[PDB]
Amino acid sequence: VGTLVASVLPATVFEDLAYAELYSDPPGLTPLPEEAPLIARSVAKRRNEFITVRHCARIALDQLGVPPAPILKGDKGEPCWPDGMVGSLTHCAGYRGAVVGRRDAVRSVGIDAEPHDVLPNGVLDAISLPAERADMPRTMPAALHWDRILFCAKEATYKAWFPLTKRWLGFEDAHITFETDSTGWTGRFVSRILIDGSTLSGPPLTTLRGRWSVERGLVLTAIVLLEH
Numbered sequence: 001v002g003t004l005v006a007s008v009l010p011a012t013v014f015e016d017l018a019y020a021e022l023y024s025d026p027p028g029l030t031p032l033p034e035e036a037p038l039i040a041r042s043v044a045k046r047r048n049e050f051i052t053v054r055h056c057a058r059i060a061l062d063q064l065g066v067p068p069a070p071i072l073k074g075d076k077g078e079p080c081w082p083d084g085m086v087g088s089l090t091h092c093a094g095y096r097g098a099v100v101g102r103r104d105a106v107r108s109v110g111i112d113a114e115p116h117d118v119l120p121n122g123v124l125d126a127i128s129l130p131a132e133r134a135d136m137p138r139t140m141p142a143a144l145h146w147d148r149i150l151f152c153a154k155e156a157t158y159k160a161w162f163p164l165t166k167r168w169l170g171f172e173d174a175h176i177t178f179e180t181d182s183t184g185w186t187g188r189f190v191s192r193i194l195i196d197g198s199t200l201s202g203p204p205l206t207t208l209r210g211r212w213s214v215e216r217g218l219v220l221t222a223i224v225l226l227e228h
């Protein structure tokens with residue numbers, strides 16, 4: 001279908017969002033000349049996914065009425081969206097995707113995709129708080145890899161946070177609480193910011209609500225912060 005990420009998008013502002021996803025790199029796709037410098041020293045696997053993900057971004061932007069154009073890279077790797085637009089990009093094995101939104105409705109977007117696979121226990125302690133490790137088993141079905149899902153939400157949280165603050169957010173700086181829908185493979189989370197949430201404009205970031213899904217061997221997460 002090409003609609004997996006829809007499982008983590010809200011209906012509230014759906015008319016002001018667009019998305020596009022692919023599951024592999026179309027062969028022979030050429031980079032835009034203006035984007036080529038961004039991957040001039042990159043390994044082949046990175047080059048290929050970069051091009052595919054940028055292609056998805058333009059497909060999604062086009063749905064919102066934005067003419068196709070290069071998307072450069074700014075502070076700390078963040079994508080440089082066209083004026084009036086926000087969005088987020090992600091890839092992993094078997095997935096490339098873009099979610100974009102109109103800034104008049106959507107303040108920020110953060111998405112992440114991961115394989116639904118375990119993480120090593122050493123990494124878990126580095127990416128989680130004790131309270132998360134205690135609560136996730138209580139809120140998540142035994143079948144799910146809650147370590148990986150937590151991590152996915154941490155990544156979505158950073159991506160939604162950085163464009164608004166331009167500051168680091170570490171794994172210990174957000175406490176994420178989950179809930180599972182009765183059907184067992186989707187739900188909600190809230191990321192509570194534990195540090196100063198001052199933004200370049202608008203209100204401070206204190207809480208970021210998101211959605212998660214597990215389907216087709218993937219974890220997907222998305223945060224869509226509304227403009228009020």
Ligand SMILES: CC(C)(COP(=O)(O)OP(=O)(O)OC[C@H]1O[C@@H](n2cnc3c(N)ncnc32)[C@H](O)[C@@H]1OP(=O)(O)O)[C@@H](O)C(=O)NCCC(=O)NCCS
Nearest residue numbers: 076077078079089090091154155158159162169170171174
């Ligand atoms: C930046 C980061 C979140 C990217 O996530 P990832 O799982 O490695 O890779 P993904 O494919 O999902 O996402 C990569 C895309 O993220 C976007 N991105 C990179 N830096 C970014 C930033 N500072 N802000 C917003 N988006 C960013 C880019 O569009 C990038 O793709 P591109 O280089 O092709 O444009 C991750 O690599 C990282 O450095 N994390 C540390 C910060 C963190 O997770 N903190 C926890 C907060 S609770």
